[PDB]
TrEMBL record, chain A:
Belongs to the hepacivirus polyprotein family. The chain holds residues 251 to 534 of 576 of the full protein. It comes from the Viruses. Glycans are attached at N3, N112, N156, N275. Disulfide bonds join C9-C83, C32-C200, C39-C66, C74-C144, C88-C132, C149-C177, C161-C165, C187-C224, C232-C257. This is Genome polyprotein. Residues 1-284 form the Hepatitis C virus Non-structural protein E2/NS1 domain. It comes from Hepacivirus hominis. It is found in: Host cytoplasm; Host endoplasmic reticulum membrane; Host lipid droplet; Host mitochondrion membrane. The lineage of its organism: Viruses, Riboviria, Orthornavirae, Kitrinoviricota, Flasuviricetes.
Automatic annotation (TrEMBL), chain B:
Coiled coil: none annotated. This is Genome polyprotein. Signal peptide: none annotated. It is found in: Host cytoplasm; Host endoplasmic reticulum membrane; Host lipid droplet; Host mitochondrion membrane. Belongs to the hepacivirus polyprotein family. It comes from Hepacivirus hominis.
Length: 284, 82, 225, 213, 242, 211
């Protein structure tokens, strides 16, 4: 509620989404099994086999809540299509306010033609941020991001990973293929309004992780899907490259049912525990 | 950490690939640091125990060119609890 | 798609208190702020009070402070409004509709009453009890057309359904709205235009009906002297 | 406080006409306003807000305007679904407010009432109460006056009347007025009469009866 | 087997009951006191589990340490007093259909099997009750305490079968239980049957005792039924003769 | 959940192999299950946990085995103290339920019954109500008594009681109490009690006349 945050929006469908901006209200959960009916798993897709290049603009008007959504290069966007704060985030959630035509600060409550947002994005460390996410006037999530990757593959099931999908291309990785929040095909980043833009990612458990990108510090409150009894055989573990948090004397904090990329504490390979999914042993 | 390309999936594993093995002998096998090989033999695939980060053997009793055939279907030191 | 359903019709005596509730259903969210309105019969609407969707602290009109309280529960998405010291003129139909923020901007954002509204619940604040009607014949006295009727008086509560010739005669029938008498009871008048030649040949009968008292009266009307 | 008033109290026109309604406040309100259409006997609906913006699903024919104190809901062409009352409403953070309400109906040639008088029934007289019924039928416009006469004496404050909704077919109105008096008072007078004044009537028409007739 | 409980209690409907389950071990440090209810006439059913331990263990969800049965939430309250080394079943709003017995059990749980985070380790699950102990009796009904009505079941040649006849003493219109019956006073027992009390109409209890006795003994020795309605303090001694 | 077992009742002899199975609608994970034993008028005690492991102080006679949806309780040789009611207590998965129950009887020779009737006491009649009781004892269980008031069958007005299994004779006994007002008793003269038994070729009727 600052005088540098655009608030132009029409609840034209009378769905009452704007209320959650002011006072929290529970989201009707019975609609999710239909809303996420086309968020296919990473397992059922094609397999990349060749050189990997920064992909081209993928315009298919897909749904922006699934993890495998392929955003597009963007930039300046008129200030009359954004309601609520815009979260365009470096690996740690950060917020960019409204600016003037040429970047100078503006304090007009976003109710003016001159005010505009700038979202010229490039990968870190030398860039600024990976991707953006906001909700436009009438209440639909919108996203941006740097070009996804062209995994290739054979058949019409090409993937074009917007995130760090170790499977289907061992060389794909977040720092080189990331687009938006999804650190892996399972886990989001957590910011105050995450429950607003992404409606019912509300049962995700929260983990403490810290990551290194170009020799810089980062603390992330990743909020990552789960449920007990889910098969997590060794062929169901995605590379969430990161700096562990030293959870205990001889254990590390890892995203659920996954693994990080580091040599053991001493004379050891990666040693993952069979039942406690989110622990990787230092030395074993 | 190495990978296993099979069945349309990629999953991590610790068994050395052919590109990671250089010199082999009748019983003594050396490897690039960062994995532990194993050998297909007489319909028996045993995990080649390693005594150093670079040297390994099958049986330390007695000890204390393309001759061997390895494989990438080998789960060794893969999820050892403590 | 959201549906709002109120309570049922209610009858109470002056000096008591009445409690009315309505629940939302089939909405993308769970709890919606609900605001009520009231209209005395034959009068412009009036806003009673409701739950503010900005802070949830209920706010009432300046003329209902204390007299009315507003409470709601999050379990069933239901809202409650109870009265106190019902005067006889509070008889009206009560509507509950969502207070949804639609326009927003300018350092503040304004709410509005938004479609749809509840079906409506009627409260009849009177001291009388269930009483049947007193049917009398409005015997006609000229010209090519004759006017007659069936006078129904001293009945309560509403409604009363009157059919002429068991619904056979429906042309020219004029049914007048009921009125609240000074005695806490209600009256009625109904008149139909018919030719004078058939005054003494066709059966003229009024099917006076009163559901609350379950009384059926079928009075016969003849031409007057 | 804020008091919203509408002028005129009632309006008339025909299909395809252009009509205007005026809603004005006591103190200047920038743009906070909204007009609800309330069908008789049904739930009201929203039409416009901010004094100029249309509501989703509303035909573009409706076109509000104004600012400050005076506003208006002008319709280019009327339709059969337009015959209702529009409650110009004001809103704010705390309270809400409604205006008395305007009505729009059909326009038709003036029609004279057909006055009829029915003497009180014997049953109610035996009950100790007298209630003379006075009737006006098939008249237009709504505006008409009725007076009571008992032995040529004027009466006021002792009668009640009812009004029906506009006839759907003939576009006229009907009215009944009841004069409440005691049985002793009823037996204390001889002649009873109603004096009715209507615009379509050149002169008032008096319908009278004698007791025991 | 460490369990001592208050004896039977009789309470009016719609009252606030309370029953304690002390453990002779007096060490409620790793004991998961359970609560199993078993009304006469049918099988038993679990009611609730209380954990003296901290939040470290609880149950899978990690919610309060007093997870209740399927249909006993709020309608029962289970509490422990570790400092005083006593248990309890703090009650409210007795109903008329809650007659039966209420047990105690150690209920050492079963460790978690499957998948779980490092944070959710050591999160037990249900499954044992182990050693039980004696029990209690709560009976509640609108009827008040009253004495017994003893009626002699007069013997007759109609009721006589061979040498051994049929007779007894009828006890009816009494509450609460139990009524200790010593049929024939200090007489030898041979085939005497004392059927359990039955709840007849009007919310009243009845019990019958029947003894088969030789015909000659009837004429050569006397029979007196000794009944002790302790709950109402009424004690009666009724004799049966032809 | 909704554990079930068959048969409802058993009838065996001491020293004999016995089987007892309780079936679940859904198989419990990791073979989580346990049985209980309840001697009459006593605190039930634990027998088996895990469907195969035996608790302390248990003779090798009682044991069980199985997995998935199938389970069984096995007694090597029945003993005089082995007769009781057994409950299997499915647990795990954050929920625990109990079986209905299964009782053990003694399979002995069929015994014929003895029919008795007691006209209501004079003091009982003075109270305004009559209670005629037809007594049955020393027979073989699973029988049914009938009522006839002046050659008129009665239903819904008689209360029956049953006796537990005898220690020595191993027989049952009933007390069918028929409740009728003093006016109803006086309205009819002939009163009869009849019983139907498997071991009886024909039902036996005992009747008396009022007064
Ligand atoms: C969190 O994880 C759970 C489980 O890992 C996700 O639930 C799963 O969602 C997928 C996507 O729809 C479901 O697949 C569906 O299967 C049906 C047939 O059953 C098929 O017709 C659909 O086309 C679709 O492929 C899957 O069944 C479902 N699993 C369970 C156990 O419900 C969930 O979506 C993830 N995200 C969130 C926010 O919960
Ligand atoms: C991992 O294993 C998969 C499956 O065995 C390999 O996929 C296969 O890769 C080869 C080599 O690129 C593909 O051959 C190519 O076929 C196309 C025609 O489809 C042809 O134009 C090319 O010149 C080349 O011959 C083969 O199609 C492909 N099969 C699939 C995808 O089903 C993959 O190469 C392996 N990658 C690694 C790093 O081991
Ligand atoms: C805020 O974002 C939402 C989500 O993108 C926008 O809704 C979408 O708007 C576009 C164009 O305005 C719609 O495209 C059209 O769809 C219709 C079918 O409904 C089709 O017939 C047209 O040819 C065209 O493709 C799109 O459908 C719609 N998304 C829906 C309905 O789910 C919304 O317009 C944005 N608000 C603003 C102020 O920009
Ligand atoms: C996130 O977790 C919550 C908590 O479990 C989920 O809500 C629960 O959803 C289940 C499935 O519908 C509900 O059970 C159902 O209850 C209805 C009666 O309300 C019954 O008719 C159904 O047969 C079914 O048993 C459960 O009540 C509900 N609990 C709460 C507190 O809302 C929610 O679905 C989860 N959402 C996601 C996206 O995972
Ligand atoms: C070593 O670890 C790997 C990593 O998980 C194991 O590979 C997986 O092994 C299972 C067990 O055979 C395979 O499941 C199979 O699925 C097919 C359907 O595709 C089914 O027809 C088979 O009956 C079986 O259930 C699974 O596919 C396989 N994963 C991959 C990616 O190949 C391997 O089994 C482990 N071996 C040892 C000796 O520990
Ligand atoms: C949370 O969302 C679910 C999903 O829709 C809501 O259940 C749905 O509720 C609506 C409103 O009652 C039901 O519509 C009804 O349809 C029948 C005809 O089938 C009609 O006669 C009723 O008047 C009403 O319009 C809809 O069937 C129902 N869907 C299901 C699958 O049961 C639920 O009410 C929402 N909860 C809240 C608190 O908003
Ligand atoms: C608020 O946003 C809604 C969203 O569409 C606007 O509705 C559109 O208004 C234009 C102009 O009248 C129409 O041409 C469109 O057909 C409307 N869209 C729909 C879906 O009906 C509305 O005009 C906006 N109002 C304000 C005041 O900004
Ligand atoms: C940030 O992105 C915007 C959007 O692509 C860029 O705006 C474009 O600028 C080029 C060159 O000035 C024009 O040819 C395009 O027409 C512009 N696009 C639009 C949609 O107007 C902007 O230049 C980028 N920022 C910088 C510093 O280059
Ligand atoms: C905008 O907000 C800042 C800080 O909240 C304040 O210092 C400044 O005066 C404000 N300007 C306005 C309201 O014009
Ligand atoms: C919009 O901004 C321009 C310059 O940035 C200014 O001149 C104008 O007054 C502003 N309009 C409003 C409505 O704030
Ligand atoms: C690819 O084409 C085939 C053939 O029509 C179809 O069955 C399949 O669904 C397609 N896959 C995708 C990802 O569109
Ligand atoms: C180790 O023992 C195995 C099993 O007896 C034998 O086959 C193998 O040759 C031995 N190797 C050495 C180096 O002793
Ligand atoms: C590695 O080399 C051995 C020895 O020639 C051979 O048997 C084996 O198939 C090779 N493995 C691969 C994956 O090429
Ligand atoms: C992991 O949990 C499963 C499930 O009970 C169990 O069977 C397995 O033995 C556990 N792992 C180890 C190493 O014990």
């Amino acid at each position: 509620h600052i005088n540098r945050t655009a608030l132009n929006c029409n609840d034209s469908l009378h769905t009452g989404f704007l209320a959650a901006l002011f006072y929290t209200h529970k989201f009707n959960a019975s609609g999710c099994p239909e809303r996420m009916a086309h968020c296919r798993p990473i397992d059922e897709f094609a397999q990349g086999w060749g050189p990997i290049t920064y992909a081209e603009g993928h315009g298919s008007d897909q749904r922006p809540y699934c993890w495998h959504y392929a955003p597009r290069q963007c930039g300046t966007i008129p200030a009359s299509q954004v309601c609520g704060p815009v979260y365009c985030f470096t690996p740690s959630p950060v917020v960019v306010g409204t600016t003037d035509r040429f970047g100078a600060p503006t304090y007009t409550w976003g109710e003016n033609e001159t005010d505009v947002l700038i979202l010229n994005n490039t990968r870190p460390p030398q860039g600024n941020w990976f991707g953006c996410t906001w909700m436009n006037s009438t209440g639909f999530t919108k996203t941006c991001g740097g070009p996804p990757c062209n995994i290739g593959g054979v058949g019409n099931n090409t993937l074009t990973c917007p995130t760090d999908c170790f499977r289907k291309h061992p060389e794909a990785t977040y720092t080189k293929c990331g687009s938006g929040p999804w650190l892996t095909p399972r886990c989001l980043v957590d910011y105050p309004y995450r429950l607003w833009h992404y409606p019912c990612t509300v049962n995700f458990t929260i983990f403490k992780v810290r990551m290194y990108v170009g020799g810089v510090e980062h603390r992330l409150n990743a909020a990552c899907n789960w449920t007990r009894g889910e098969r997590c055989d060794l062929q169901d573990r995605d590379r969430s490259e990161l700096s562990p948090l030293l959870l205990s004397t001889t254990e590390w904090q890892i995203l659920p049912c996954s693994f990080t990329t580091l040599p053991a504490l001493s004379t050891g390979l990666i040693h993952l525990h069979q039942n406690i999914v989110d622990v990787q042993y230092l030395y074993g | 950490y190495e990978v296993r390309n099979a069945s349309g999936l990629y999953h991590v594993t610790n068994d050395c690939s052919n590109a990671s093995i250089v010199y082999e002998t009748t019983d003594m096998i050396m490897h690039t640091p960062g994995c532990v090989p194993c050998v297909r033999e007489d319909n028996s695939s045993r995990c080649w125990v390693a005594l150093t980060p670079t040297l390994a053997a099958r049986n330390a009793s007695v000890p204390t060119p393309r001759r061997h055939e390895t494989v990438q279907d080998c789960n060794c030191s893969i999820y050892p609890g403590h | 798609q959201v549906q709002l359903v109120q309570s049922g019709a209610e009858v109470k005596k002056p000096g008591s208190s009445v409690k009315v509730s309505c629940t939302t259903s089939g909405g993308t969210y769970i709890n919606y702020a609900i605001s009520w309105v009231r209209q005395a019969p034959g009068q412009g609407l009036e806003w009673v009070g409701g739950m503010s969707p900005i802070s949830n602290t209920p706010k009432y009109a300046q003329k209902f402070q204390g007299r009315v309280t507003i409470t709601a529960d999050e379990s069933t998405s239901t809202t409650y409004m109870e009265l106190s010291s019902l005067r006889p003129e509070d008889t009206a139909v009560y509507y509950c509709a969502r207070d949804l923020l639609k326009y927003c901007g300018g350092g503040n954002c304004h709410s509005l009453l938004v479609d749809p509204w509840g079906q409506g619940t009627l409260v009849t604040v009177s001291s009388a009890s269930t009483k049947g009607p007193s049917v009398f014949p409005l015997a006609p006295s000229s010209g090519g057309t004759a006017a007659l009727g069936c006078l129904v008086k001293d009945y309560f509560p509403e409604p009363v359904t009157v059919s002429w010739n068991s619904g056979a005669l429906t042309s020219g029938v004029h049914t007048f709205p009921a009125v609240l008498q000074s005695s806490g009871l209600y009256s009625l008048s109904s008149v139909v235009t018919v030719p004078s030649s058939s005054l003494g040949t066709q059966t003229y009968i009024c099917n006076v009906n009163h559901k609350p008292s379950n009384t059926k009266v079928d009075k016969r009307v003849e031409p007057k002297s | 406080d804020i008091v919203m008033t509408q002028s005129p109290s009632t309006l008339s026109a025909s299909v395809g006409d252009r009509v205007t309604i005026s809603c004005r406040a006591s103190q200047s309100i920038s743009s906070w306003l909204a007009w609800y259409q309330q069908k008789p006997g049904r739930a009201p609906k929203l039409l416009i807000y901010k004094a100029s913006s249309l509501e989703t699903g509303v035909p573009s024919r409706f076109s509000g305007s104004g600012s400050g104190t005076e506003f208006t809901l002008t319709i280019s062409s009327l339709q059969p679904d337009d015959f209702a009352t529009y409650y110009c409403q004001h809103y704010n953070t705390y309270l809400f407010t409604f205006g008395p309400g305007t009505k729009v109906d059909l326009k038709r040639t003036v029609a004279a009432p057909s006055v009829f008088i029915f003497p009180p029934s014997d049953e109610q007289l035996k009950s100790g109460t007298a209630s003379v019924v006075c009737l006006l039928n098939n008249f237009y416009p709504r505006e008409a006056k009725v007076q009571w006469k008992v032995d040529n004496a004027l009466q006021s404050g002792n009668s009640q009347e009812s009004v029906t909704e506009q006839d759907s077919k003939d576009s006229t109105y009907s009215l009944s007025s009841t004069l409440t008096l005691s049985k002793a008072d009823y037996e204390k007078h001889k002649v009873y009469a109603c004096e009715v004044t209507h615009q379509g009537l050149s002169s008032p028409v008096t319908k009278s009866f004698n007791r025991g007739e």
